[PDB]
Design a protein around this ligand. Structure first.
Ligand SMILES: [Ca+2]
Length: 270
């Protein structure tokens, strides 16, 4: 999808971070420190499932993923080296229209917010009606909201199909833009939010933003996986080590900005 120059000696499979520009900064910083001391870095666009599939078929050397369980299983299969590397922390957010037809209260737990939206959507007698936008595309965001609905015992997509469960299958920015224009609630991410026009942000309200607390459902941890059969093995090991060092990777992440805001939080202290 794009190669950075600071011979290809490092292939990374990822979705959101490359799409946000972080993979560029990271790669240019790594190439920098290896040459600045004693090559190009190619980025392959892929969701977590594919990234792991690539590591398995040796298409990429490393992969930044967003699923601790999938990561653990990839390692159990010998697809990935043990252990995984905590790279950075992204955050999901529940946003909705200023009219707040679901009457969500900022202090409520995210699960109770979902319970409230469901009942209000089922009542269908609000102005505007309560609707929830799902990217319905197997992405980390889709997994997240699907997870949240199930957490309160609901399956909106299953028969006796919940018509207020709105399938708008597109990339992050378009989906958030659509939710705002249509006056619907939706789970989105911090980076996508900072990507839309300021004007649109005034046509929506942030009802819940993920924190860095380890058990916050809206926390979106990113880990790096080193392929077991990976080509350029020693460099994948080099990148992995560099990425988590306060000196390299963590410094670049702590300073990576978008719309004048730090996009991601550094990995937890270790
Ligand atoms: Ca996503």
């Amino acid at each position: 999808e794009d190669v950075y120059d600071g011979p290809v000696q490092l292939r990374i499979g990822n979705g959101g971070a490359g799409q946000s520009g972080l993979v560029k900064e990271l790669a240019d910083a790594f190439i920098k420190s290896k040459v600045d001391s004693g090559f190009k870095v190619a980025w392959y666009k892929s969701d977590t499932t594919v990234t792991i599939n690539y590591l398995k078929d040796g298409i990429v050397d490393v992969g930044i993923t967003y699923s601790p369980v999938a990561e653990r299983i990839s390692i159990k299969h010998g697809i990935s080296e043990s252990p995984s590397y905590y790279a950075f922390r992204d955050h999901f957010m529940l946003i909705g229209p200023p009219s707040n037809p679901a009457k969500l209260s900022g202090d409520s737990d995210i699960a109770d917010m979902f319970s409230k939206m469901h009942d209000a959507a089922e009542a269908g007698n609000t102005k505007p009606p309560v609707r929830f936008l799902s990217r319905y595309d197997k992405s980390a965001t889709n997994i997240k909201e699907a997870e949240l609905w199930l957490s309160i015992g609901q399956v909106p997509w299953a028969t006796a199909y919940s018509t207020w469960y709105h399938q708008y299958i597109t990339f992050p920015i378009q989906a958030l833009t659509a939710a705002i224009l249509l006056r619907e609630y939706t789970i989105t991410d911090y980076g996508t939010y900072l990507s839309i026009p300021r004007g649109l942000r005034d046509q929506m309200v942030i009802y819940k933003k993920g924190t860095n607390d380890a058990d916050d459902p809206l926390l979106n941890p990113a880990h790096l996986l080193v392929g077991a059969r990976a080509k350029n093995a020693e460099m994948a090991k080099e990148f992995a080590k560099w990425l988590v060092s306060k000196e390299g990777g963590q410094k670049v992440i702590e300073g990576f900005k978008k719309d004048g805001q730090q996009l991601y939080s550094p990995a937890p202290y270790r």
